[PDB]
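worker-3 :: picked Serine/threonine-protein kinase WNK1
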Amino acid sequence: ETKAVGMSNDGRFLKFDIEIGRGSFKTVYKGLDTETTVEVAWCELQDRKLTKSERQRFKEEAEMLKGLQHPNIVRFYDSWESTCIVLVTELMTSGTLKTYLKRFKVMKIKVLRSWCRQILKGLQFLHTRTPPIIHRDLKCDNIFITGPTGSVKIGDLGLATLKRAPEFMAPEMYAAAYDESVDVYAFGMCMLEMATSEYPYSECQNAAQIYRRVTSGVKPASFDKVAIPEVKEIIEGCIRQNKDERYSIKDLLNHAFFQE
Ligand SMILES: COc1cccc(-c2cc(-n3cc(CNCC4CCCCC4)c4ccc(F)cc43)ccn2)c1
Ligand SMILES: Nc1ncnc2c1ncn2[C@@H]1O[C@H](COP(=O)(O)OP(=O)(O)NP(=O)(O)O)[C@@H](O)[C@H]1O
Ligand SMILES: [Mn+2]
Ligand SMILES: [Mn+2]
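worker-3 :: tokens ->
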């Protein structure tokens, strides 16, 4: 009933005073939608002080996000202003994939093949949009376990961007022109800690040490613990330094491992 401590404009989403997860800018409460009767994540972020143009473009982006609809992607219902910004998405109650790994050291090859395949289908869906969507912050903490089946969904598109369709560019500007292969690189690291149950580059203290190891062709210490050679080769092709030498999602789905 209307225990709601927060308000919906049309009267569709009620905010309860039950904090389900606490973060940097994201304070997510437990909500409820009275139309599809689904429990809903009521998320509210710090007030964005944006101009009369960027307050505009957030609106058109929110209705883009409503067009997305994939079984491997957490659904985006609506968003609105209120006093800050409050986002409203499907509620995940089985936790994230990383916490699912924080309790066991070996994942069955069946579950790893199945869940990784569903992640690729999610990434592919985002990349086949017009304009294509690049997640840019893919990790096991942004992948959620859902349902009785135990399927996986990719959420938290906060650091995502649209695929952007000079002469003496500096080296860092050649790196600024990246693309969807940043999600493939992130997929390789996800599949790595799903088969090792160990955070990649845990032996490193900061990103500086991590960057110096990748460009020098030094993989995480945990990479030499992958028991399955076929899995080890897939991760290899995803975390290569040159983006042009990384696997494509189509080839990964057409890999013998994921067609098995
Ligand atoms: C299914 O989608 C989900 C699911 C779960 C969480 C989120 C989410 C989105 C945001 N979020 C971030 C932006 C910034 N612009 C980048 C944006 C531009 C359009 C294409 C996607 C990226 C933004 C703009 C409008 C908006 F309604 C929400 C927005 C912040 C935090 N969680 C989205
Ligand atoms: N759709 C959702 N349903 C239920 N819980 C969620 C949902 N999205 C996020 N959460 C939880 O809310 C909390 C916020 O975490 P997160 O989304 O990582 O933002 P953050 O903590 O600021 N960034 P990070 O540095 O990546 O942890 C986490 O505990 C999530 O597990
Ligand atoms: Mn997150
Ligand atoms: Mn290749």
